[PDB]
Design a protein around this ligand. Sequence first.
Ligand SMILES: CN1CC(C(=O)N[C@@H](CCCCCC(O)(O)c2ccon2)c2nc(-c3ccccc3F)c[nH]2)C1
Ligand SMILES: [Ca+2]
Ligand SMILES: [Ca+2]
Ligand SMILES: [Zn+2]
Length: 368
Amino acid sequence: GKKKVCYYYDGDIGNYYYGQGHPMKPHRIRMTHNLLLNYGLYRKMEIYRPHKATAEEMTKYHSDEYIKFLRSIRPDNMSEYSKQMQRFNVGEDCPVFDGLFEFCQLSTGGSVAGAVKLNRQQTDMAVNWAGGLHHAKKSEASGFCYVNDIVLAILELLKYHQRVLYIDIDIHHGDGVEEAFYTTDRVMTVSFHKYGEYFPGTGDLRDIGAGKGKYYAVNFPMRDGIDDESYGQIFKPIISKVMEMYQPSAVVLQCGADSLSGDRLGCFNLTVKGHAKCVEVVKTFNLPLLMLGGGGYTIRNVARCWTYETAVALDCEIPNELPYNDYFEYFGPDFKLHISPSNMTNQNTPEYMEKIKQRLFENLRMLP
Ligand SMILES: CN1CC(C(=O)N[C@@H](CCCCCC(O)(O)c2ccon2)c2nc(-c3ccccc3F)c[nH]2)C1
Ligand SMILES: [Ca+2]
Ligand SMILES: [Ca+2]
Ligand SMILES: [Zn+2]
């Protein structure tokens, strides 16, 4: 039936700034929070302020040298770290900004705290819209991500769960999470993403894991313009087959909103309803679930998406007319929650979708 939802948020998160011209805007987390507060969704969930994750918590995955660098570098001392900046990929995509380490601590704190709550069986769902930074690697920042909160949260879940399923619906391949667990069967990673002349360049259909992890990495490569109809007809059948064969005891879902129509960096054509249908599909399996954020660069649509997905988690119907809120003017000219798809061509033909789904089903038949 209806589930208990715990939500993690720190009011300072919206003040972190990646810099002029950088598309990653932490302010979108504050817009999401304010919109869900104005819809009255706070009366239905337990709201928690995550602790600032320690460097020691982060080193459960990341190297000590990389975390020490993140905790030390500042815009005023960057000139003394030119060597380490190259080594750790700190630059254009992952710039040094004021409070960078504290931003990593809050993003990570929400994911790990949510995983602990799920482990203690004190909640059915835990939500951290500030997390989902799937590109960060053991000793390298990548794609606007510095600390991989998802990997840290999964390591926490693995303390009480034999098998953990990770699903990633961001438009970009979830490479950091896939790499972290590539040789183990204790985590199955499933990523649906744009593939072909697109960042990060990984996530081919043929990347299926290695060693004990062979068949435990799943990648569904897509072309521009995927719509609600096309995405919906492959998502439920794939997730149902993965649940059947893998039988996970906990799930982590990365809800990157850059797969929505009109995203500044994305080229997909999903509506908020089409994106949220993924949450409905996963939630239906009644397993402990950690829901995380990720990309999303047309910030009014990110706030709509994550507000609607929080309502989906709560089994709460909310009106299409937006309530008045601190950022009301950002939602013009319509001031509605739901969005319309564009007229862009869907390059994912029905035959291509079925063919890729059948290739993934062949790989899923290889599980024990
Ligand atoms: C060396 N060249 C730059 C590399 C590249 O194409 N980078 C992507 C990175 C896109 C990252 C997407 C992140 C994500 O949405 O998956 C995400 C965000 C949080 O968690 N996951 C990118 N950077 C930008 C960008 C960076 C700084 C300033 C302006 C920009 F447009 C746009 N797209 C190649
Ligand atoms: Ca993905
Ligand atoms: Ca794996
Ligand atoms: Zn993305």
